[PDB]
């Protein structure tokens with residue numbers, strides 16, 4: 157476990173959300189080629205059926221889908237339980253689905269804000285909570301798929317960028333707690349630049365003109381970084397960009413701030429209850 | 431308009447949320463000493479009443495309170511309209527209320543996550559949307575009260591930190607678009623370190639031991655930065671901390687990314703629709 161080897165996903169039990177098309181579908185493909193057990197989800201029954209059949213073709217140990225909407229928090233919680241049952245456990249939770257709005261100036265569409273927060277952030281939280289016990293018993297891993305727009309802001313897309321930023325605040329804090337605690341569930345935040353997904357290409361078409369990175373490789377890098385158990389994985393179309401997105405200032409401040417807690421109390425209140 | 435002068439708030443029409451205690455109450459007092467028109471809100475009717483009477487005493491041009499809960503998006507939208515009518519307009523919207531959770535390791539309390547997102551983030555957005563036409567006609571200003579834990583993560587407090595990070599993703603993008611567009615409503619993100627608020631002193635008591643900055647001055651600095659129309663205002667108990675909080679990387683990458691849009695198309699799509 158220093159360099160990635162495809163063999164590391166052999167027989168591992170993996171959930172992939174938003175896997176009927178785009179990057180998600182690609183993640184399933186690569187996991188199937190590695191011979192992982194795979195449970196795939198999104199809203200479209202027929203699209204997921206195709207992915208499932210393709211994954212068995214490619215050499216998945218097993219492949220199933222459960223269709224539903226990630227704005228229903230009850231489905232999200234119950235999806236994880238079914239997924240565990242079909243696999244007899246869970247090694248990796250790949251949180252990938254997303255709601256995209258139109259690239260537009262914000263004009264007070266508060267329903268876009270709410271829907272984006274529901275689909276892109278709250279459900280990732282619900283999925284993680286439902287999966288935590290299985291991940292803890294397998295010392296497994298969570299991929300939190302985000303965006304450059306979750307580290308930095310871009311005109312158009314405020315609703316989306318709010319939800320992605322929220323992911324960083326929540327999961328980074330969680331990892332930080334897991335580290336002190338010492339939980340042995342790893343959390344990888346994936347910071348992706350523009351990707352040549354069909355929705356993204358259509359979305360950005362007359363609007364944003366920077367180059368797009370390929371989805372097949374993107375999907376691979378997500379699994380690499382999650383398997384290698386990294387805090388962050390950057391796939392952003394350049395080697396110098398990630399240095400400007402990982403602000404060392406925050407790193408230093410988080411480091412400095414830890415010496416400000418009284419760990420004796422914190423750790424013994426935790427053992428008392430909660 | 432280069433150095434702050436108390437005169438700049440004289441007769442200005444200001445909403446302050448979460449203003450029955452802590453920093454909010456201090457904001458109302460400072461605005462009253464400057465002779466502003468003030469509408470104050472929070473859930474506690476009797477605590478608000480006291481603050482209003484103190485504000486009139488301290489020299490407010492006028493002072494009123496409307497009590498209600500920022501979990502209720504209907505109240506938030508109707509509060510801004512009533513506030514505007516009491517004052518005949520609005521020059522400054524100070525978004526300060528917050529729900530605090532106990533400082534505890536996260537153990538799957540999804541309701542804390544939901545409620546924090548509701549009170550700390552969604553309501554900020556609803557208030558701003560409701561206020562925007564009055565703010566556009568006055569070319570006014572919004573203060574978005576955040577935290578160091580909205581730029582950086584801290585163990586304990588994950589749900590809170592998600593909400594604060596959300597505010598940065600949302601409002602910073604909003605400012606971006608306002609500059610392009612060219613709206614003339616300023617948005618000041620207030621990054622506060624530890625403040626000697628009663629709630630904060632109780633909350634952190636046996637747990638976090640860093641020094642606390644005074645709420646009276648904190649409240650003043652929030653209004654100076656908002657009146658001076660700053661993108662960001664730092665009040666963090668140190669002069670070098672802000673350097674580590676404002677990632678220059680982010681600013682460079684935002685500046686570079688701008689030249690990546692086709693603004694001709696963006697601006698003409700805006701002009702035809704939306």
Ligand SMILES: NC(=O)C1=CN([C@@H]2O[C@H](COP(=O)(O)OP(=O)(O)OC[C@H]3O[C@@H](n4cnc5c(N)ncnc54)[C@H](OP(=O)(O)O)[C@@H]3O)[C@@H](O)[C@H]2O)C=CC1
Nearest residue numbers: 174175176178179198199200225226253254303351353356
């Ligand atoms: N494409 C890019 O340029 C970038 C992508 N990313 C990130 O990568 C991830 C995937 O992006 P991408 O592959 O382009 O997205 P796509 O639009 O290609 O695919 C999104 C997937 O999520 C599913 N989905 C959408 N809405 C819901 C819902 N309400 N409930 C359940 N499932 C849903 C979709 O299926 P269905 O619609 O049938 O439900 C689909 O399977 C996201 O987290 C995104 O933020 C980050 C930066 C850039």
Ligand SMILES: NC(=O)C1=CN([C@@H]2O[C@H](COP(=O)(O)OP(=O)(O)OC[C@H]3O[C@@H](n4cnc5c(N)ncnc54)[C@H](OP(=O)(O)O)[C@@H]3O)[C@@H](O)[C@H]2O)C=CC1
Nearest residue numbers: 448449450452453472473474500527577622625627629630
């Ligand atoms: N205090 C500090 O160490 C730090 C504070 N900040 C920021 O400063 C701001 C003020 O915090 P502070 O003075 O410490 O907090 P306080 O607890 O002192 O004040 C909270 C205010 O918000 C109101 N409020 C809480 N919940 C709701 C609700 N659901 N609906 C409407 N009003 C509500 C409270 O009254 P009621 O419950 O009666 O409604 C009260 O008036 C916050 O945004 C905070 O995040 C940032 C960094 C540090």
